[PDB]
Each structure stands twice: as structure tokens, then as C-alpha cells.
Amino acid sequence: VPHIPRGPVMADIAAFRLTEEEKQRLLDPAIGGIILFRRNFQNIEQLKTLTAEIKALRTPELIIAVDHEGGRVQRFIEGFTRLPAMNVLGQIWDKDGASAAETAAGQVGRVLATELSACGIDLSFTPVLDLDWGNCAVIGNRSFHRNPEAVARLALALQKGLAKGGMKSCGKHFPGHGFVEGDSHLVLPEDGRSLDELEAADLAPFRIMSREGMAAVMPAHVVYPQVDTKPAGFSEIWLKQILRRDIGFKGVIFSDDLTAGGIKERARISFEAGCDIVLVCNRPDLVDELRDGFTIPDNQDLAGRWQYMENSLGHEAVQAVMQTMGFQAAQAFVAGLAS
Amino acid sequence: VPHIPRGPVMADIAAFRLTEEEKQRLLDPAIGGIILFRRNFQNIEQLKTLTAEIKALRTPELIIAVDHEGGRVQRFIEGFTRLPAMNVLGQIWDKDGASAAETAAGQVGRVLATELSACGIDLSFTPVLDLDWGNCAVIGNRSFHRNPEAVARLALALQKGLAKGGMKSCGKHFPGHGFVEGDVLPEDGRSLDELEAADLAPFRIMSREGMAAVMPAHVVYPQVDTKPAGFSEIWLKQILRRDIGFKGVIFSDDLTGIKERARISFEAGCDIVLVCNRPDLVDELRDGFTIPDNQDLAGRWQYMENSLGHEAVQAVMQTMGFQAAQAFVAGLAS
Numbered sequence: 001v002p003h004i005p006r007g008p009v010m011a012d013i014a015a016f017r018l019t020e021e022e023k024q025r026l027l028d029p030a031i032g033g034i035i036l037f038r039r040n041f042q043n044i045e046q047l048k049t050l051t052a053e054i055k056a057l058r059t060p061e062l063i064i065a066v067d068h069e070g071g072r073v074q075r076f077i078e079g080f081t082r083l084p085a086m087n088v089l090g091q092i093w094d095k096d097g098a099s100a101a102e103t104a105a106g107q108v109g110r111v112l113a114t115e116l117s118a119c120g121i122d123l124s125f126t127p128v129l130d131l132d133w134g135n136c137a138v139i140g141n142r143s144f145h146r147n148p149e150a151v152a153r154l155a156l157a158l159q160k161g162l163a164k165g166g167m168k169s170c171g172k173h174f175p176g177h178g179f180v181e182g183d184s185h186l187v188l189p190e191d192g193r194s195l196d197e198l199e200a201a202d203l204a205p206f207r208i209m210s211r212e213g214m215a216a217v218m219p220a221h222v223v224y225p226q227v228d229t230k231p232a233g234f235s236e237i238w239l240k241q242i243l244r245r246d247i248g249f250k251g252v253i254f255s256d257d258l259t260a261g262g263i264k265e266r267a268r269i270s271f272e273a274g275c276d277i278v279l280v281c282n283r284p285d286l287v288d289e290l291r292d293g294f295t296i297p298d299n300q301d302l303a304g305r306w307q308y309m310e311n312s313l314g315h316e317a318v319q320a321v322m323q324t325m326g327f328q329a330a331q332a333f334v335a336g337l338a339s
Numbered sequence: 340v341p342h343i344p345r346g347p348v349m350a351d352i353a354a355f356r357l358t359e360e361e362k363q364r365l366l367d368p369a370i371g372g373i374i375l376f377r378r379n380f381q382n383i384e385q386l387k388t389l390t391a392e393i394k395a396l397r398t399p400e401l402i403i404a405v406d407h408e409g410g411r412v413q414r415f416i417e418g419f420t421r422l423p424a425m426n427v428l429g430q431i432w433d434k435d436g437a438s439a440a441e442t443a444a445g446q447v448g449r450v451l452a453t454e455l456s457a458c459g460i461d462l463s464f465t466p467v468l469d470l471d472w473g474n475c476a477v478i479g480n481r482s483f484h485r486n487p488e489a490v491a492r493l494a495l496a497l498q499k500g501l502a503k504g505g506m507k508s509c510g511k512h513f514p515g516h517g518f519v520e521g522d523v524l525p526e527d528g529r530s531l532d533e534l535e536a537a538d539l540a541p542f543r544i545m546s547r548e549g550m551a552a553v554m555p556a557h558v559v560y561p562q563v564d565t566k567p568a569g570f571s572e573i574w575l576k577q578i579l580r581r582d583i584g585f586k587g588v589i590f591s592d593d594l595t596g597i598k599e600r601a602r603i604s605f606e607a608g609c610d611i612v613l614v615c616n617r618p619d620l621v622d623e624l625r626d627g628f629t630i631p632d633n634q635d636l637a638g639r640w641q642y643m644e645n646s647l648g649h650e651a652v653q654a655v656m657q658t659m660g661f662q663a664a665q666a667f668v669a670g671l672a673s
């Protein structure tokens with residue numbers, strides 16, 4: 001079992017089980033993790049086999065992630081508790097108050113994370129910290145609430161739930177996707193507001209989550225012209241000056257999905273902007289192209305940043321906890337929010 | 340005022356008033372219409388000036404469209420009734436029943452269309468007919484409901500409301516965007532029979548009842564064709580034209596080289612290609628552009644022209660009936 005540091009590329013895979021070509025690809029030192037999608041999911045037992053064989057390839061084991069937010073963003077359905085959209089938690093906030101909402105958020109986080117942890121997943125890319133300004137359809141009900149205080153507090157409660165289930169958090173989409181309009185899949189929207197306007201609202205949940213141990217951030221594919229002419233995920237100003245320096249964030253900055261102008265070049269500008277890890281999804285050809293003759297950028301923090309995201313619960317421990325009545329009750333409560 | 344047939348390209352504009360460059364661009368015979376966005380909107384009086392100067396450039400007047408669906412898809416806010424998201428109507432269906440929901444949909448359509456008609460807009464690109472399978476974030480609350488019958492009936496009711504306000508309808512996104520995940524080119528692995536049993540039904544029914552246009556999904560349905568619907572002869576000619584009998588406009592995807600992308604769109608069966616936020620690509624496309632032979636184009640554009648005159652709209656907006664509709668719709672949105 002070769003010992004290779006985790007590389008700065010997060011790749012993905014085609015279907016339910018690794019092919020031999022995929023095995024060879026995932027051994028490449030450029031690769032440090034894998035993101036899974038619905039096409040990689042048949043059922044829980046197949047998923048476990050898949051994650052196990054991914055992990056067996058090398059050490060430190062490749063980090064495995066998935067998008068389980070809730071509602072219309074939940075890759076794995078059959079055999080999982082159906083998760084509510086995050087705005088359901090903000091509705092509980094408005095109706096039954098903060099305390100009831102935080103409690104509910106904690107249970108959602110716990111169920112979400114624990115069920116995934118049982119299958120060998122390290123991390124879900126959640127929570128969304130975007131504010132519901134009533135402008136952005138693609139975010140829509142994925143946002144907790146309009147109000148930055150409600151968003152921050154529900155997110156922090158969800159984060160504690162996730163940690164019970166073995167997982168860290170990944171805030172999306174820095175520095176805030178809520179204000180732009182977005183309803184035409186694959187446009188690159190413009191947020192004309194000033195930095196002060198963002199500091200007063202959209203940035204606050206990111207600051208607070210950062211302070212409280214958030215492991216990673218996904219950037220918005222959005223241009224904020226008053227701050228920089230470049231989209232946030234390719235902006236030194238956003239990523240180094242604001243997120244690293246001003247906010248003090250020490251975790252992973254993921255790139256957007258880079259999938260021409262060329263993949264090598266697109267990765268280069270991402271790393272140069274301040275991303276730790278680049279995502280290359282649905283395009284194993286571009287991963288092959290990128291990794292061939294790839295020089296790993298010097299990043300002394302990478303190994304620790306990946307390692308902070310490793311699942312904290314052992315597989316047997318998780319199967320045990322899922323048999324408990326306490327956890328089964330949490331499951332039923334969360335299921336109820338989703339119906 | 341030059342007389343030029345409406346071309347097969349729908350373009351757009353930068354800001355609140357036409358620049359001289361834009362005027363010259365919109366005179367190109369390749370162009371037949373314009374889509375507006377929030378960046379084009381300051382207030383109602385500015386919008387009226389904008390639409391008037393667009394219309395003054397040529398005859399038949401360039402068709403002007405906008406995305407007023409409701410909720411988080413409503414370009415023009417100030418001075419307009421705030422529209423509810425379409426899933427609000429489906430929640431009324433579930434809670435108060437079909438009859439209350441249809442009535443509410445009719446009123447939403449009427450208010451939506453009438454207020455835009457007063458500003459010189461021809462058409463809103465609505466309704467979304469995608470089913471809420473709970474899978475697709477980019478559709479999200481833009482879908483009426485999970486159930487094809489609820490979607491069809493709420494859409495028909497909205498359509499009647501739109502027609503009262505002077506407008507035709509445009510169903511989106513053919514043959515159904517609801518099942519894929521979308522948060523890239525998504526893949527819907529289902530069979531044609533599965534789609535006929537659900538996602539396609541609202542499109543068939545709307546087509547039968549006079550829908551003017553369709554927008555295709557940027558989605559591949561491999562069991563039917565390896566190409567995305569908007570570039571598929573099978574989806575657009577064989578299924579939509581031949582099998583369903585649809586005679587209206589088929590718009591393309593936002594195509595944002597461009598010449599080749601447009602060519603394959605027209606060849607697949609689109610009448611009109613959309614090129615948004617990229618006047619450079621419109622300039623590139625129109626330069627040396629040959630207009631494809633389409634004897635139906637002129638009538639297809641003309642069917643979408645607003646059916647209410649300016650005076651008629653002002654009259655209806657003063658009525659108590661319309662003002663009440665406005666307040667009812669405002670109440671769904673709050």
C-alpha cells in the first residue's frame with residue numbers, strides 16, 4: 001500500500017466500482033481526494049465497497065466528499081434519511097424560535113453526517129451560508145434564511161451536529177451567492193455591491209464559521225466588480241487578502257469545477273489565486289491531461305488542511321451508533337421535517 | 340423606418356437606454372427580438388422609453404421578452420406587483436384544492452402580463468412546466484408541483500391569465516428539466532415512456548391549448564438521443580413537431596464558434612437562437628450571417644406579439660377588478 005502525500009486535485013469516478021484505469025489514475029501523486037455523485041450510488045453496500053476500495057489504494061487515504069445539503073441537493077437517496085431543505089430550519093426559526101431551530105439543525109447535521117460516515121465518506125459539502133435575498137433561484141431554498149444572524153447561528157448548530165457524526169463543515173459560496181440572480185445554468189453573474197455592504201451581511205456567517213472551526217470553503221462563481229474584476233474563485237483579493245489575511249481562515253479553499261484555454265492553465269490560475277485544491281469533475285480526460293507532467297505547487301499547509309477533513313469516527317463505531325434508539329429517533333425526526 | 344423581416348436571433352442590451360452601437364446592432368437583419376434583464380431596468384417610465392426606442396428602429400417591430408416567472412425569477416421589481424414563486428400555487432393546490440389554486444394562477448398570470456404589457460413588453464418566458472421531482476436546484480421553487488396533473492392544470496390557468504394581459508406563453512424546459520440534478524451538462528437516464536407518463540404531459544397539453552413557444556432543456560436523455568434536447572432533431576422534429584404537433588417557436592439554449600453552435604441549433608429544429616450577455620458573439624454571429632430558410636418564422640414571431648394596445652392596458656389597470664387582482668397577488672408574495 002504505497003505511502004503518497006495527498007495531492008492538490010480532487011477528481012471523481014464514473015460509476016459504481018473502480019475500473020483499473022481509475023485505480024491507476026487515483027494513484028497519481030497529483031490526486032488527494034474524490035467527490036462522489038448520484039451516478040456512483042446504487043445502494044449502501046455497494047457504496048461501502050466503493051469507498052473501501054478507494055481508501056485501500058494509498059495512504060494517507062484519499063479524502064472522499066459528497067454534496068449532501070438537504071432538499072434538492074442530496075446525492076444518495078435510497079437507504080438514507082431524506083433531508084429537509086435548509087430553509088425549513090429558517091422557517092422553524094421564524095415560527096418556533098431560535099432555540100427550537102438550533103436543536104433541529106443539530107439533529108439534521110447529526111443524521112446527515114452519521115449516515116454518510118457509515119459508508120466511508122469523510123465530508124459533506126455543507127452548509128450553504130448564502131443569504132436569501134430573494135434574488136437567486138439556484139440557491140433558493142438551499143439558504144437557511146434572509147438574516148445573517150439566523151444563517152450564522154443555524155449554520156453553527158448544524159456544524160456541531162455534523163461533528164457528532166464525524167464530519168467537519170464546508171461553507172458555500174464565499175463570499176456570498178445570495179444577492180445575484182441565477183436561473184440560467186452556467187452564466188457568470190455580477191454582484192455590484194460594495195465590500196462594506198457584504199461585510200455588513202453576506203460575509204458575516206463566513207467570518208463566524210471560520211472562527212468556529214469550519215474546515216473548508218467553496219467560492220462563488222460570481223464577480224464582485226467593486227472588489228475585483230475576477231470571479232471570487234480566481235481572485236487573490238478575495239482569497240488571500242480577504243479570506244486568509246483579513247478573516248484569518250486557515251482551512252481548505254476549494255476551486256470551482258474547472259471543467260478550453262487548457263486545464264493546466266485553469267488549474268495554475270486557481271492555485272495562484274489562493275485555492276489549495278482544484279476540483280475536476282465529470283472529465284477524467286482532463287484529469288489525465290492535468291496530471292501528466294504536473295508539478296505539485298509548494299503548499300506546506302496542504303497536508304494538514306486535508307487531514308483536518310478526515311472523518312473522526314471509525315466504521316464499526318458508526319454502525320454501532322446507528323443501531324441506538326437515540327440515533328433512530330433523530331432519523332425519524334429529520335425524516336419528518338422532510339415530509 | 341426600415342422594413343426588415345424579423346431575423347432568427349434574439350439578442351439583448353447593456354443598460355437602461357440604447358447606445359448608438361446597439362441601435363446599429365439591432366438593425367441587423369439577423370436579429371428579430373430582444374430579451375431584457377434586471378440591468379435594463381431603472382423604473383417604469385425609463386422602461387417604456389427603452390421599449391419604445393427598440394420598437395422604433397424597424398418594422399415589424401422587434402419582439403421584446405423578459406423572464407417574469409415569479410419569486411426569485413422576476414427581473415423588474417420597483418413599480419411592479421411582487422410575484423409569488425410558482426410553487427406557492429402548488430402549495431395552494433395541496434392545501435385549499437385545485438379550484439382555489441387555478442383561480443389564484445389565473446390572477447397571477449393576469450397581473451404578471453398586464454403590468455409588463457403596459458411597459459411595451461410582448462412576452463414573459465413563462466411558465467415553467469418542469470416537475471418538482473426534488474432533484475434540481477436550478478429549477479427549485481420555479482416548478483409548480485411534483486404532480487404532472489397539477490402542473491398542467493396550474494400552467495393552463497396561468498396561461499389564460501397571461502392571455503387576458505395580452506401575452507402568449509412559453510413552456511420551459513422541454514422535454515422536462517425536473518428530474519436531473521442541477522446545482523455542466525446533466526444526464527436524465529429515463530426512458531421515453533417514463534417521460535410520456537409524467538414530464539412530457541404538461542407540454543402536450545399546453546401545446547394543444549395554444550402555447551406560443553418552448554425553451555429546451557440543456558439536458559441529455561441518452562435513451563432517446565445522445566445530444567442535448569436543444570440540439571436534437573429527435574427531440575425537436577420527431578417528438579415535439581411530428582408526434583406532439585407543436586407549431587410555435589422553438590427557442591435555442593443560450594448559446595453562450597458561435598456560428599457553428601447556431602448552425603447546429605437551427606439544423607436541430609430551433610426557430611430562434613438566444614445569445615445573451617455577449618454582444619461580441621452577436622456581432623461575430625451576424626457578420627456574414629446567412630438567414631436559414633424558414634417560411635414559418637414570420638408567423639411564429641408574429642403570434643407572440645402583444646395583443647393589447649396601450650390604451651386598452653391603461654383602461655384595464657384602472658378597473659377595480661384588476662386593482663383587486665394586484666392586491667391578491669401581492670398577498671401571495673408576502
Ligand SMILES: CC(=O)N[C@@H]1[C@@H](O)[C@H](O)[C@@H](CO)O[C@H]1O
Pocket residue numbers: 183184185374406464477511512516554593613
Ligand atoms: C433556467 C434555465 O434552465 N434556463 C434558462 C431559461 O429559463 C431562460 O428563459 C433563458 C433566458 O433568460 O435562460 C436560460 O438559462
Ligand SMILES: CC(=O)N[C@@H]1[C@@H](O)[C@H](O)[C@@H](CO)O[C@H]1O
Pocket residue numbers: 067125138139172173177218257476521522
Ligand atoms: C450549486 C452551486 O451554486 N454550486 C455548486 C456547489 O454547491 C457544489 O458544492 C460544487 C461541487 O459539486 O459545485 C457547484 O456547482
